[PDB]
Amino acid sequence: HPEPVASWMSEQRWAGEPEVMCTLQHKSIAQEAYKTITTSAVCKLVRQLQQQALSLQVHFERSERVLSGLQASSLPEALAGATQLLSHLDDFTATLERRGVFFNDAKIERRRYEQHLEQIRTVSKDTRYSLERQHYINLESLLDDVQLLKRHTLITLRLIFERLVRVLVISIEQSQCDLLLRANINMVATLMNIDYDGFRSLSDAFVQNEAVRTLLVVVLDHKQSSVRALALRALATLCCAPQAINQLGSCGGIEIVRDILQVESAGERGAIERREAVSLLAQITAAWHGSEHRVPGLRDCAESLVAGLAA
Amino acid sequence: HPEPVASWMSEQRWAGEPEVMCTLQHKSIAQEAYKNYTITTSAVCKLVRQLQQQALSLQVHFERSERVLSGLQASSLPEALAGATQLLSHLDDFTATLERRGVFFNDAKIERRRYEQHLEQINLESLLDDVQLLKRHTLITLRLIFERLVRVLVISIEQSQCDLLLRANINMVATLMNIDYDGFRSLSDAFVQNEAVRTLLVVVLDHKQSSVRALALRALATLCCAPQAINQLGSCGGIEIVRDILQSAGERGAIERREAVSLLAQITAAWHGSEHRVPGLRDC
Amino acid sequence: GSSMCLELALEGERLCKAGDCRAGVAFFQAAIQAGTEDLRTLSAIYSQLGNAYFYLGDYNKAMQYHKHDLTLAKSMNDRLGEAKSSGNLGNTLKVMGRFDEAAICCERHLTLARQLGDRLSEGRALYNLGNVYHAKGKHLGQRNPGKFGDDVKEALTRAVEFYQENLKLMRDLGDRGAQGRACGNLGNTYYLLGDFQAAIEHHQERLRIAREFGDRAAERRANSNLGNSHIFLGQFEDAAEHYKRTLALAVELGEREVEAQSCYSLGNTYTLLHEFNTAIEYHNRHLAIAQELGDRIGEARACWSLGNAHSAIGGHERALKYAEQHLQLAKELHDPVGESTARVNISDLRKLLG
């Protein structure tokens, strides 16, 4: 009865390459909240602010470089760049405006915030006068004004970021829903994915609000190992700044993390939690600023001890 | 001269909260891309993660049937027949979903035919071993599928043209190896057999930008949950490479050294002892 | 065209939809430098770049890439894509303050939508034009009116017309929530125009729909708007009702600034009803929140209003205290315009036992 070729053709009667494409539709939830406050909106806000502030910082830096003579550029190009810099600064200061609700019980901070904002507005106005009017433009005063605006902007952003972050850290501190706890911890992990130093720095925003101590409390007290792992992961992304590391050691965080990796070397309370704990220890030992003699000798000792076993 | 109420009414002249004024509609890159092209690196990742999360449910279903036929959660025997029917239907649905997403797989339904005969005809211990057999078989087939899929990713890494897509593809494995699962949803061995370790070491070596090397080091760090990947790492002489990242020369640094020491710790996570020395290094 | 450009654009889309549009822009621009060919995906890249630049506050580059998308679609005879691009471009131009150009773009979107037959795109277009002439009207009214009305009047009138057209189309189609938005903006336009009664009507319909969909935010907005309109119609009772409801929904939603705003509003509303006690209470709440947040301007307003509201009930003693606070805050905030002189005035006029 049977036959190879006939079988091949018999089974090839049905075969055929399908144009696989998914046509499934999707309804967004975000749009149903688009067409105050919640941590989500806050995080979106600090991300938008961060990116805009970066794009502004490259402008401030460029105009600085040009007006300093560090970067070759014609005078008309320089003045035009300064003007559009002022434009960007205006559009940004506009977004820094109606932010009252975040300064709850922060009267000092709001006074400073508002003050420096007014300073930005005024100096911007005077500078724009210096460029638009005035026969012989003073470039010295122009550079000085640009740098001053950079100063004020920096301080302003530091303040508002501190408040915005305080929202999140407090939301973690006073959690009442475990899922939202995980979500928020994940939000601080996301917010510190890339650490900056310029306008968009969130380092001191997390340092001043005692985020490290909060997350360490989460690690200490929580029942679920998953959430503890999440908290360790979030702690590891804060230990880029030395201040946060000091703030970790001050709480005896090193001892706690060290305790995570043993408890008489017990099996339970693992094991991705361990994988994040050693990650924390790693990020910490990465600095290694520029001191200590034993902290290098031991490191090299381990580095060789591993090379022995592997090779 | 002025009045509080009069001033208030004077300033409420321009007040009033409006509906959404700014619209802005999006032109989907994904729709046009997925309907005008057969992309094979990101879609493959979405597919392997989907398959992962499905494999999880399939596994817990197998475990449930096992618990039933073990005499643990057993309350009836025809109930176990119905449960068997559910199990087979689920398995066949998983298969159909595979074929629907355009991934063919050679399946000699031997164990399944064993179970099918023993069930269609009808001792619980006679069926338990059949269930375990089908479980192991399905596991093997799954792991082969995962190997075949991940291979695309690893190849996409070792044959990248653009540095940005190189970064993205290097990070996709890190996102995939976010959490290792010991069951059906395991992707570790899929990365082991495809020698992702050697590839990532190749790019921590040959590449010229420090950031990319750092990324690769991070992915390597994610892969060091499995012992085979660690032995595979030591085989290529990766330890010497990392020790070169750390030990003096000024060309690489910052993020790269961080991911390097992270990888070193993750590898040396076989036994914790020097961490206490690092604690004594922190206490002073 | 190539896999490189496509995957670049994909990752860029991911980055933009997941947060950092600064990196998404990098991937997009990297994709443009790669294999284009497929003009559909190219148009998508240009457009998404436009929106990304809109997100980063670089509205000029947004306009640029959006117009590039528009051209790319126009050359490809893709009418729907041209309509979409015209919409985005128009919105961007509106934000930039170039209202006539924006009106042209949105009008193009409209006529194109009417040609294509897509009714929802027509609705979106009408609503957009409404927003454009609304924004234009508000801008002109705030910084460039002129004898007599007159351009602001025509602008707001236009916005009203388009909003009405949109509302009619939505009533025909059956989309209730869209009627909600339409009624909201229509009511606000009528509010800025002078027809407070029509504003009350449309805002009332907005409130009704907001209730229908369980949209408490829209409920609160509609209530506040109705409160203002009723205030300007002299009907202080209804204004008190709506302001109270606004306050309730404000504390229900956790809107502190809106809470304080509503309290001050209720204070002024009850002062117009000659019930200075209740008014004093509400003004006290507003002062509480203003102090809590550091709203020194609002604290000044509160001290002023509380001063006069205490002079009206008899307690001039406390009223002088409040007025003194008003003066101090006036000197602090540098408000010579009136606050300094006004506080001086109401202090000297009071005192009695000098």
Add this chain to the structure above:
Amino acid sequence: SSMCLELALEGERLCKAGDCRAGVAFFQAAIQAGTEDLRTLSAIYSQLGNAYFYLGDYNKAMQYHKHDLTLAKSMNDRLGEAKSSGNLGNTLKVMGRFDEAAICCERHLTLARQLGDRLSEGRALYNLGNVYHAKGKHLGQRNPGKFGDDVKEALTRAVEFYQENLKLMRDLGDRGAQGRACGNLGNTYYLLGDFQAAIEHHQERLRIAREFGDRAAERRANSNLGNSHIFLGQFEDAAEHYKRTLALAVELGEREVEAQSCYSLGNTYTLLHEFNTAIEYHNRHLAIAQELGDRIGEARACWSLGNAHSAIGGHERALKYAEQHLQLAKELHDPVGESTARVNISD
């Protein structure tokens, strides 16, 4: 209400990221105590539908798409109702409930036509074509022996809808959509028997695939054309396409597809009585198959190679291939193959 919004937001975020079981957990936790706001709730129902579909729990997917649908109907949101109708119809199609699926997709169609949305109309047409196509391909599986009246009815309807979609896509100028529609049309025509129409539509598909530079789609269309030519008795053209299939298969580094193409060319040249050249392709096929550890394809390879060597005259080789064939058939336990080997090992 607010907590619901946060929960549902993180759930949406998790679903966009791929983690759908966690997203489902968050969504259910969002419904646990929440809105009020009907729009958000409906969105949550939809998201849950697509998430459960993503997870393969088609029951709950169908259910929450049903809830999203009734909520959309209550709001009289015609477009949302169209969306939920499409999704529900898709989930229904995957469940094998083709009739109800067809009804839902038809609702999507009439709504899309009402709103003037030609894009959603196109999606609806493609959906209907898909559900009737799959209906035919399932009915054909229930009774393998013969394409009954039912199967040809379903496939005919699928052809009609696919054609309507093609008309709309040509009218709108969506090249890729035309490509997919042409591919599906070619497949369903191939299943219908009209292999010539299959040839034409697969040709158009190849032209589009060349217009976009998608070599995977090129080898798809080439494979389909190869089959469609095999069943037309035009073995010349069949090999002509199969070779290009193999070329595009090795140009893209497709191992499995390469093996399949080699087996195909082998049987094709077996049919062309060029027994010398067929053994080459079958040998290469056995090489790739034995390389990838494919016992099934190894067995089939031994079968074809054995019969081919018997067709040449070198039975000394064919006997060996038959022995290995029996070994493989007994290894993976095949009641048919074992007998087919035992017959040709003596006879």
